[PDB]
Amino acid sequence: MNLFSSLTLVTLILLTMPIAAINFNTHKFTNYPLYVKTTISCAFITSMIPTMMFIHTGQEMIISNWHWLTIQTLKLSLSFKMDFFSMMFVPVALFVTWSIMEFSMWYMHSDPNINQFFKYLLLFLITMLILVTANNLFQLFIGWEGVGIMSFLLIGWWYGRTDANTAALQAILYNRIGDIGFILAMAWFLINLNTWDLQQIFMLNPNDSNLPLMGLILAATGKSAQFGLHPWLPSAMEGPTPVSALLHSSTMVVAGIFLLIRFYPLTENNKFGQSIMLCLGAMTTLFTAMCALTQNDIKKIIAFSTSSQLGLMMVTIGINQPHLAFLHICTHAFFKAMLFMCSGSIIHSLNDEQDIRKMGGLFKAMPFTTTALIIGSLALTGMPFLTGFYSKDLIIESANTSYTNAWALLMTLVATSFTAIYSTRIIFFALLGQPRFPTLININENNPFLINSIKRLLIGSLFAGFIISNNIPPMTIPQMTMPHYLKMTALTVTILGFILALEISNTTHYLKFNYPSNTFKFSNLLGYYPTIMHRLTPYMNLTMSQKSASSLLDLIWLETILPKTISLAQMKMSTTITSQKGLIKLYFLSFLITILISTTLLNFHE
Amino acid sequence: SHITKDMLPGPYPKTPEERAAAAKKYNMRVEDYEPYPDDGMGYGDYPKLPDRSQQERDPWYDWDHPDLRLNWGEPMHWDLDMYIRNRVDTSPTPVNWNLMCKHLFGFVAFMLFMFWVGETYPTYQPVGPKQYPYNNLYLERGGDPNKEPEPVVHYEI
Amino acid sequence: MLKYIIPTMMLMPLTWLSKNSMIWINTTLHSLLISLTSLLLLNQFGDNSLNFSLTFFSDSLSTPLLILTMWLLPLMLMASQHHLSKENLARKKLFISMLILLQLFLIMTFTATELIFFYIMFEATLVPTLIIITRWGNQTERLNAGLYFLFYTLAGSLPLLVALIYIQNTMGSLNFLILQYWVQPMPNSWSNTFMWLACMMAFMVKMPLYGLHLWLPKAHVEAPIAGSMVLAAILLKLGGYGMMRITLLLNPITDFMAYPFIMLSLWGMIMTSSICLRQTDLKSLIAYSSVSHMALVIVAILIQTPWSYMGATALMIAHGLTSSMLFCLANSNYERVHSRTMILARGLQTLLPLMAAWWLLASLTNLALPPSINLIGELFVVMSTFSWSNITIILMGLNMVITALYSLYMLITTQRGKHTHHINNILPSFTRENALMSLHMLPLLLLSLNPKIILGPLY
Amino acid sequence: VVRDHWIHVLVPVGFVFGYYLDRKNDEKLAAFRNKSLLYKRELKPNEEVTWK
Amino acid sequence: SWDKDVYPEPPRRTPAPSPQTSLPNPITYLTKAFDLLVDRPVTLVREFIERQHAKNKYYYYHREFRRVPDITECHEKDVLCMFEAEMQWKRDYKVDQEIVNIIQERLKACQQREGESHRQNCAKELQQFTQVVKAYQDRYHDLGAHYSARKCLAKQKQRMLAERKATKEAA
Amino acid sequence: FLPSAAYLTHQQKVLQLYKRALRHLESRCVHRDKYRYFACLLRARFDEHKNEKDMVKATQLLREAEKEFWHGQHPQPYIFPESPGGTSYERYECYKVPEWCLDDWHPSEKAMYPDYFAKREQWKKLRRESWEREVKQLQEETPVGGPRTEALPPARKQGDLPPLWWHIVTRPRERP
């Protein structure tokens, strides 16, 4: 088909021309942000069309060309496809990133290194798009490590600031543990099914699916900021703000679980696999939910919130419902891109003090961003018919109506209450209280690009959740037959969480000054996991690197065993042989005893 | 252009001359100079310092090298490659260390214990199997088109 | 191949009877013309190899390494001024002619039909490198480095000659085809085991593996840039080339006797990647990086899979390019500040704005960036070794994690965060250094587009 | 043009010499001209040669 | 072009959509605009280029070989027999790898054409895939990197001798 | 570890304790009014036993005060976004290009900016002219063989610039 394939390929190919613009530049532009924004707008307006054709007819397809190293029984080309997920995801990402181009025209206007910034961020979009279009698994690996290293650079944008390059080093380290998991899965697929190709792998159903799915779990919990490898996410928040928006709202964080959403016909079986899936999801959900409480920075609250949402998506893969998880990806992406962009607006408006202490009075300080925050932190919980209703509450309904682990259900329930209460506390300390922020104020939103971007994403997070979530072919069986107190329980838990957080707020209105009781510490110090592991394992490995590797094994022992013993043997034998004083009687006595020892002891005439 | 006798062969003995030479050579106080001692792990006679020294050194003193916390004449503790900020932060913790590791390992053990208690005791809604029409949906499983027509039926209840 | 031997000879009196301040242009121009003519070789097809005599012949393993040698010559011959541009005309001509003679013996060695001829030109490659690093080592232990280099490489390499003479007079001639087409299995006796240990241990010395690797880092931190880059790239990948050729004989006993070398190579790959994480002396990090990657190459050669040999030759060529370039950036920073250390020369993002791109791109080609050739080599070695055993992939991925860690630490240590503001001598980057960086990187990316060249015999 | 500067002519003429001598070696090693069992057609059309 | 019998294609099945209600149909207007803006000019350009091609006439032929006899008919050493033998075997090895490539591409195409019901009309191609790949696993697999031809014939003799002992036990 | 003295003082140590405890109480105690109440309570607790004439009782109360402070500190204190550990903390260290450079330009770029380079030339002449005799005589005239402090003397003799001023005056603007 001409139109469908041609328009998908031009949506891929429009994100190569501004790299040609900077490479063949030679006379430096000024409207290069305008150029990147309008080419992302054109890429979205050509990415709307084949999705419309997809819902209107069906008609999935793959394209595959330019094979290189067709060596053995396998062959690999640039091979990418558009199916349900693979082109229902792309317009959402392009739309979100076009709004971030608006907000990054505004927010990064006063820094003269803007061209290299938009170069890096466009290249990041290119790599994540290559990740979400491909079916050749090696091309998925290309997109994987490419978005890992662009995440490294965009976290370490502000050179100087040892926190930033420490953050970037932690991010690339956990991405290489994602790499060891993913290459273990790739090795099993090569050796047991002759390829890494999703068509043939789904064509079979290999039943001994333990080693590859364990590798997939390791790769997903590395890339998707989950328990065991989670604490790089607030550290990743320590970079620039639209960096953090694009990097942990829509892209680069769903690419852990998007692989598992891709491999649904292989994880149809293996009850052990789904048990690991939803146990890990419930652990992450409760852990970063409890850790999100008593956090006093904005971006770290938003990072723990998005980690809890990815925990619900791992629960959504544990129950056999992948399409609901994909719907949650889309709505979540719109939602937290809008939330990050609103918080970045406030932080640049208030001289970057950035913290929840010394933040208070912002309602009626022009209330466009307060409207954005109340729509957002309303939409994070289950609000009965908004965008956050559909995904999250179908997730908890299908999680409750299944043969589940009976404790993961309780973990997701308690953590839904926890996301209700930190949503309430971020509203209360950000917008409501008495104004605590220093004088000579220049709070400003008389500004075209800011209100256009926030406008576009609130129009997104009000309608596009329903528009996406309704006209899709039903790829599963909806449950739809619940008792009482199993459908009501989402709204019940969010309302009791609001009552709990509002009474905690009214106790904050009091004055008693209670001492902490170390659960405050356990929830306040990011959990003890970052401090304990980041002071043990950099100390243990490098203590065993100085003693064993550096001074002990190579240098001192290997230079004693191979050079020194040989050289000292030659030195001592030389100082025994050549140390002869010149008396002739000794030499002729040596001749005589040589003659006797050759005749009678060790015979030479016999 | 450098003196050969500003390097460091041999350990501490003897006590007047070598300690006086090392104290004049490392720009250190005489009683602040401490070798490791000579257990034979190498180490020459390089001094022992209080070993942490990098999330200390309060950053308002305004020395020379700002992101290294050195001052051009400090003896530069032996493990400094492991000690820079962006490598290891041995700050005085807000709580403890032993109490922290006890709470963490107890909490992780409790979460995995309750996950095991969950894995032995599942929940389920009161519901039979999913009844498939044509021989437990045969011919759309792995195949065998004429080998095994397996007689199994469902009944209305 | 004589059409490549004889203009390498003819390029030598060029350097003598070219006049003052004109030897440079003539040698660079003519060696680049030799590089084009070298690239015209790539004819090799299908069934057989190609025979450029009963004396010269080219396998498809030898073709990209030969083009690598005749491409790395002009890059080096431009790379080696500004630390001998003030020296004498006669010593300058002697240095340039020494590099030309070293190229000549490397071409001799890569198109060696006979293994006896291969051994003679192997240690003929060994000869001039000692003279180069000792006469222009620019440090005080260059004597120690050249002497350890000499006696390690001889005393490992020497009973290989006795084993090759024994094969010469027990099975007829030593053409690779008649060593092939005739090779019979050699059972598990003890003399066969010692013959195997002699040959494989000579090349074990040359790669190096972990128990014999302190050979290398002194010969890189105490050597000029020409000897360093030729030493690393062409000599280690020549050792790998030689092991690839000689391992066709001794087929059954490698399964019996080749377990401890795999072991020492794997555990020393891990320990070497760990030791190059905490060191100072910026030059030495790339040296121990080379030790780690060639231990990976050794694991790849001693397991005997076609996937393993393709990944081995790809890893050889990619790591040769990457480590030679990264040596050259280290020498550029050493010419900026006379330090050799790492914690001193800080900053350099603010100053020298273009050099950050070359540091980043070389560190990502060392990172195993996924379309690059380095990840192609490492990936096929990981596939083959997981076919070897289901448990050894932990060491491969742990090498991967630590390799990314130390490479990116080497990036963000020297060139990230704050100039020490007492340096005030560094000049903006010359056109020469960036021309050298563009001569390194652009063939690697253009091979990343089309890597059907560098995959070896089992394509 | 030659005696003006004669230094740049050295190695291209050296390569032409080496190419000529490789063709001379190939003419020297011209046994099995049509004695392979695979590359063996009757000689045609004019004069005596199939490779040189 | 290509033979339709080596890269097979099932016949096309395409419905005629009956619109219930009348908005109508944005993609029909958009595909007519696509036809008029893309389909005509690229066709005119290709027709011009094809006339410029068919002004002259090149031809390339397919290279073909003969059957040099065997490796089973070569003697102890006889290097000018083993050479033709093993090059004939190596060319069989290359073309047999590409046979495996063709069958695996057929399996991929059966996966993607037949849609969300994999096991309908893909049983035959999976059957012949397991057949040819069982033959490959038996014939070329466990010999390693220094295959010449002789290890393959040694594997041949060893496998048929082991099955001879197996059928002697089965007698 | 301070430039001017060796030990702080007793009073200086109590004063740093007071500022740190008051800052941690700021961070602990939001809404600013219950903060003001608790801050005046802390000020009264210091006032109740400020006038004790001993000294070992003073260091006794100081030591137990550090104990009962380090019990009750706050985990993430509100540090300002210029302090070490803060939100920015040399955010704009990207752009602090030092002024020993800018002399290594091509002369066409020096022909784009005439006046600033001419005035940099006169500042550099002012550096080179008044370096040797005045600054080195004031640095090798007043100290003993041991300097024993790090405060350096002003130039009050007759004329020109203070000693060792160049890399303290010509530092970047800290918001470039």
Chain C: closest CA distance from residue D5 (Å):
10
Answer yes or no: are the C-beta atoms of A398 and A319 closer than 8 Å: yes
Which residues have a Cβ under 8 Å from the Cβ of D30 and sit 6 or more positions away? D52
Answer yes or no: are the C-beta atoms of A109 and A66 closer than 8 Å: no
Chain B: closest CA distance from residue F51 (Å):
31
**Mutate: best of A114, A432, A509, A511, partner F, most F CBs <10 A:** A511
Backbone angles phi, psi at A294, to 5 degrees: 55, 65
Q: CA-to-CA distance for A307 and E13, rounded, in angstroms?
A: 46
Domain containing residue D40: 1-51
Q: What number of other Cβ atoms are within 10 A of residue C364's Cβ?
A: 22
Amino acid at E1: S
Among positive and negative, which fits the CA dihedral A224, A227, A229, A233?
positive
Amino acid at C41: L
Map residue A136 onto helix, strand or coil: strand
- Taking the Cβ of residue B68 and every Cβ of chain C, the question of whether any pair is shorter than 8 Å is answered with yes
Q: CA-to-CA distance for F159 and F164, rounded, in angstroms?
A: 15
List CB contacts (< 8 A) between C318 and chain A. none
What is the 3-state secondary structure of chain B?
CCCHHHCCCCCCCCCCHHHHHHHHHCCCCCCCCCCCCCCCCCCCCCCCCCCCCCCCCCCCCCCCECCCCECCCCCCCCCHHHCCCCCCCCCCCCCCCHHHHHHHHHHHHHHHHHHHHHHHCCCCCCCCCCCCCCCCCCCCCCCCCCCCCCCCCCCCC
Answer yes or no: are the C-beta atoms of C380 and C310 closer than 8 Å: yes
Instruction: Scan for tokens 């790499």, then name that residue.
Output: A179
Buried b (16+ CB within 10 A) or exposed e, D4-40: eeebeebbeebbebbeeebeebeeeeeeeeeeeeeee
Closest CA to A287 of B108, F75, B95, B97: B108
Cis status, amide bond into B37, omega within 30 of 0: yes
Whether residues F105 and F154 share a domain: the answer is yes
The tokens for D33 are 């001209």
Which residues have a Cβ under 8 Å from the Cβ of A509 and sit 6 or more positions away? F31
The answer to whether D10 contacts C14, with C-beta atoms less than 8 Å apart, is yes
The CB-side HSE value for A334 (13 A sphere, CA atoms) comes to: 30
Answer yes or no: are the C-beta atoms of C333 and C286 closer than 8 Å: no
Chain A: closest CA distance from residue E7 (Å):
16
The answer to whether D38 contacts E69, with C-beta atoms less than 8 Å apart, is no
Q: CA-to-CA distance for D24 and D31, rounded, in angstroms?
A: 14
Q: CA-to-CA distance for C313 and C302, rounded, in angstroms?
A: 13
The CB-side HSE value for A516 (13 A sphere, CA atoms) comes to: 20
Which residues have a Cβ under 8 Å from the Cβ of C58 and sit 6 or more positions away? C1, C41, C44, C49, C50, C52, C66, C111
Q: In sequence order, what DSSP letters do the residues of F74-133 get, joined into one string?
A: -SS----TTSTTSSSSSGGGGG---TT-SSSS-HHHHHH-HHHHHHHHHHHHHHHHTSTH
The tokens for C16 are 């003598």
- Which of C 402-441 lie inside 8 A of B, CB atoms? 412, 417-418, 420, 422
Question: How, if at all, do strands A78-82 and C50-51 pair?
Answer: unpaired
- Taking the Cβ of residue B39 and every Cβ of chain A, the question of whether any pair is shorter than 8 Å is answered with no
Chains A & E: contacts with CB separation below 8 Å: 45
Which residues have a Cβ under 8 Å from the Cβ of C167 and sit 6 or more positions away? C115, C174, C179, C249
Indicate the number of domains in chain D.
1
The CB-side HSE value for A578 (13 A sphere, CA atoms) comes to: 6
Among positive and negative, which fits the CA dihedral B19, B23, B25, B28?
positive
Q: What are all long-range contacts of C79-82, with beta carbons under 8 Å and residues at least 24 apart?
A: C79/C225, C79/C226, C79/C229, C79/C328, C79/C331, C79/C436, C80/C224, C80/C225, C80/C226, C81/C24, C81/C432, C82/C335, C82/C432
The answer to whether A275 contacts B122, with C-beta atoms less than 8 Å apart, is no
Of F77, F111, F136, the residue that ends a domain is: F77
Q: CA-to-CA distance for B83 and C140, rounded, in angstroms?
A: 30
Closest CA to C119 of C162, C62, C166: C162
Backbone angles phi, psi at A514, to 5 degrees: -80, 140
CA angle C370, C376, C379 (to 5 degrees): 95
Closest CA to B1 of A196, A589, C338, E16: C338
Say which experimental method was used. Answer: cryo-EM
Whether residues F62 and F125 share a domain: the answer is no
Q: CA-to-CA distance for C221 and A421, rounded, in angstroms?
A: 59
All partners of chain B with 3 or more CB pairs under 8 angstroms: A, C, E, F
Q: What number of other Cβ atoms are within 10 A of residue C251's Cβ?
A: 16
Which residues are A136's β-sheet partners?
A: A197
Element (H, E) at E33: helix E26-34
Interchain touch D–B (≥3 Cβ pairs closer than 8 Å): no
Please report, in angstroms and rounded to a whole number, the separation of the first and last CA atoms in chain C: 23
Domain containing residue F34: 8-77
Among positive and negative, which fits the CA dihedral A591, A595, A598, A601?
negative
Closest CA to C167 of C150, C155, C180, C156: C180
Q: CA-to-CA distance for A275 and C170, rounded, in angstroms?
A: 64
Q: What number of other Cβ atoms are within 10 A of residue E114's Cβ?
A: 16
Chain D: closest CA distance from residue E94 (Å):
18
List CB contacts (< 8 A) between C387 and chain A. 191
The tokens for E38 are 């893309």
- Taking the Cβ of residue A606 and every Cβ of chain F, the question of whether any pair is shorter than 8 Å is answered with no
Q: CA-to-CA distance for A232 and A530, rounded, in angstroms?
A: 9
Q: How far is CA C125 from CA C91, C219, C291, C292, in A?
A: 21, 15, 20, 23
Buried b (16+ CB within 10 A) or exposed e, A269-283: ebeebbbbbbbbbbb
Cα E9 to the chain's mean position, in Å? 14
Map residue A483 onto helix, strand or coil: coil
All partners of chain A with 3 or more CB pairs under 8 angstroms: B, C, E, F
Q: What number of other Cβ atoms are within 10 A of residue A417's Cβ?
A: 19
List CB contacts (< 8 A) between E123 and chain B. 143, 145
Q: How far is CA A256 from CA A121, A130, A221, C396, F19, in A?
A: 20, 15, 7, 22, 46
Q: What number of other Cβ atoms are within 10 A of residue E91's Cβ?
A: 13
Q: CA-to-CA distance for E98 and C124, rounded, in angstroms?
A: 43
Answer yes or no: are the C-beta atoms of C352 and C414 closer than 8 Å: no
Give chain C's largest Cα–Cα span.
Answer: 69
Chain C: closest CA distance from residue D31 (Å):
14
Closest CA to A304 of A529, A505, A456: A529
Candidates A6, A73, A199; nearest CB to E101 = A73
Q: CA-to-CA distance for E146 and C304, rounded, in angstroms?
A: 8
Q: What number of other Cβ atoms are within 10 A of residue F13's Cβ?
A: 14
Q: Resolution in angstroms for this experimental structure?
A: 3.9
The answer to whether E123 contacts B143, with C-beta atoms less than 8 Å apart, is yes
Q: What number of other Cβ atoms are within 10 A of residue B60's Cβ?
A: 7
Answer yes or no: are the C-beta atoms of A305 and A292 closer than 8 Å: yes
Indicate the number of domains in chain F.
2
Element (H, E) at F64: helix F56-70
Map residue A197 onto helix, strand or coil: strand
Chain E: closest CA distance from residue B141 (Å):
7
* Burial (CB count <10 Å: 0-12, 13-18, 19+), residue E55: exposed
Torsion region of C186: left, alpha or beta (phi above 0 gives left; psi -120 to 50 gives alpha)? beta
The answer to whether C350 contacts F97, with C-beta atoms less than 8 Å apart, is yes
The answer to whether C14 contacts D7, with C-beta atoms less than 8 Å apart, is yes
Closest CA to A286 of A527, A498, A494: A527
Q: CA-to-CA distance for F142 and F156, rounded, in angstroms?
A: 13
Q: CA-to-CA distance for C200 and C243, rounded, in angstroms?
A: 7
Answer yes or no: are the C-beta atoms of A347 and A298 closer than 8 Å: yes
Map residue A475 onto helix, strand or coil: coil
Answer yes or no: are the C-beta atoms of A249 and A307 closer than 8 Å: no
- Taking the Cβ of residue F59 and every Cβ of chain B, the question of whether any pair is shorter than 8 Å is answered with no
The answer to whether E123 contacts B140, with C-beta atoms less than 8 Å apart, is no
Whether F89 is in a domain gets the answer no
List CB contacts (< 8 A) between B143 and chain E. 119, 123
Candidates A159, A177, A183; nearest CB to C417 = A159
List CB contacts (< 8 A) between F100 and chain C. 421, 424
- Taking the Cβ of residue C452 and every Cβ of chain F, the question of whether any pair is shorter than 8 Å is answered with no
Which residues are A355's β-sheet partners?
A: A297
What is the 3-state secondary structure of chain C?
CHHHHHHHHHHHHHHHCCCCCCHHHHHHHHHHHHHHHHHCCCCCCCCCCEECCCCCEECCCHHHHHHHHHHHHHHHHHHCCCCCCCCCHHHHHHHHHHHHHHHHHHHHHHCCCCHHHHHHHHHHHHHHHHHHHHHCCCCCCHHHHHHHHHHHHHHHHCHHHHHHHHHHCCCCCCCHHHHCCCCCCCCCCCHHHHHHHHHHHHHHHHCCCHHHCCHHHHHHHCCCHHHHHHHHHHHHHHHHHHHHHHCCCCCCHHHHHCHHHHHHHHHHHHHHHHHCCCCCCCHHHHHHHHHHHHHHHHHHHHCCCHHHHHHHHHHHHHHHHHHHHHHHHHHHHHHHCCCCCCCCCCCCCCCCCCHHHHHHHHHHHHCCCCCCHHHHHHHHHHHHHHHHCCCCHHHHHHHHHHHHHHHHHHHHHHCCCCCCCCCCCCCCCCHHHHHHHHHHHHHHHHHHHCCCCCCCCCC
Chain E positions with Cβ closer than 8 Å to D? 65-66, 68-69, 84, 88
Closest CA to A166 of A158, B94, A529, C363: A158
Closest CA to C71 of C103, C112, C117: C103
The tokens for C134 are 């000792």
DSSP F61: H
* Burial (CB count <10 Å: 0-12, 13-18, 19+), residue C332: buried
List CB contacts (< 8 A) between F84 and chain B. 59
